[PDB]
Write a protein that binds this ligand. Structure first.
Ligand SMILES: CC(C)(COP(=O)(O)OP(=O)(O)OC[C@H]1O[C@@H](n2cnc3c(N)ncnc32)[C@H](O)[C@@H]1OP(=O)(O)O)[C@@H](O)C(=O)NCCC(=O)NCCS
Lengths: 157, 138
């Protein structure tokens, strides 16, 4: 029963159980399973900062650019929650550095929103659109300025 | 890292803690490893009416546990969230249908699609237990 196995894979990934992810994978569960809202094991592993599990999902062919019904991707989640190593890797495996979610946010908007310096650096390195605009016509520049961190706005010009 | 993502003051925090007793707790569970467990214990122990929400359980800490928020018979005032950031923001919408006054994001649960959706009053990156201890605790 793949459903049960998929739900088991999702939780183990989110929970950072290296060993367990190995048992489900070597035992048939789909690395590309989804929940009711289109979340995949990679989304959850990138959200929670589980690096080694991110590596093993990609090696076995998990889609690096999977999106939920709100248009969220693993790169969105890793950048809002401050997981740099995971950002580094995602991009190495081809993550779309300029994907937009439902609110019209990119991973640049998102790193600005919770104020990650080192993650803003890597994104501009990999071609992030410093003039991308969200549903409300705002940039990652406008944002950090609203929030009062001039230095970031300085680097995000 | 425990820095408030909301901009309320603690007069604002004392208020919600103080006027609201009806609490939906999302992501509730029997596991001790889950922070939701201890916090529910602590709320129940300090006069709150707490209804656990988790479709993977019929029951939690000796309380009927519900599949969804929509599922709760009586009124709820505050929705207390213990789920993944890829997930929590979806409860803003349900709270609004329920007629709740507050949505509370515990640590590592917030994602900004939640502002775009929001009553209501949002609390983000704080613990209901710790704020209580600090503001009202003996
Ligand atoms: C959010 C957190 C639990 C991590 O979550 P996770 O590992 O990704 O697991 P999930 O987000 O998928 O879900 C957690 C749980 O709620 C459940 N759940 C999942 N989806 C759910 C849904 N749609 N509705 C209700 N509950 C759900 C689970 O099944 C579960 O508990 P279980 O292990 O007993 O089954 C964790 O970061 C945390 O506890 N944050 C808050 C900590 C904090 O505030 N501590 C304060 C101390 S004072």
């Amino acid at each position: 029963f793949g459903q049960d196995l998929g739900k088991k894979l999702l939780e183990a990934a989110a929970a950072g159980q290296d060993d367990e992810v190995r048992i489900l994978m070597a035992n048939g569960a789909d690395v590309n399973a989804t929940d009711d809202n289109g979340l995949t094991p990679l989304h959850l592993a990138a959200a929670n900062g589980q690096l080694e599990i991110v590596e093993v999902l990609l090696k076995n062919g998990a889609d690096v650019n999977a999106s939920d019904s709100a248009g969220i991707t693993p790169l969105h989640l890793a950048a809002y929650d401050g997981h740099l190593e995971i950002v580094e890797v995602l991009l190495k495996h081809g993550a779309d550095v300029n994907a937009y979610d439902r609110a019209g946010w990119t991973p640049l908007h998102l790193a600005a929103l919770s104020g990650q310096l080192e993650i803003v650096e890597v994104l501009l390195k990999h071609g992030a659109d410093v003039n991308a605009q969200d549903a409300l016509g705002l940039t990652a520049f406008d944002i950090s300025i609203n929030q009062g961190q001039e230095d970031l706005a300085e680097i995000l010009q | 890292a425990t820095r408030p993502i909301d901009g309320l003051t603690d007069e604002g925090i004392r208020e919600t803690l103080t006027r609201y007793k009806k609490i939906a707790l999302v992501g509730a569970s029997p596991k001790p490893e889950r922070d939701a467990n201890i916090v529910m214990k602590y709320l129940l122990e300090h006069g709150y009416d707490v209804y656990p929400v988790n479709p993977n359980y019929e029951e939690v800490l000796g309380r009927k546990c519900y599949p969804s928020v929509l599922d709760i018979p009586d009124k709820i005032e505050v929705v207390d969230l213990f789920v993944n950031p890829a997930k929590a923001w979806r409860f803003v919408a349900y709270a609004i249908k329920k007629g709740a006054k507050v949505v509370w994001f515990q640590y590592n649960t917030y994602y900004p699609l939640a502002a775009r959706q929001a009553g209501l009053i949002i609390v983000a990156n704080r613990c209901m237990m710790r704020e209580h201890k600090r503001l009202l605790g003996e």
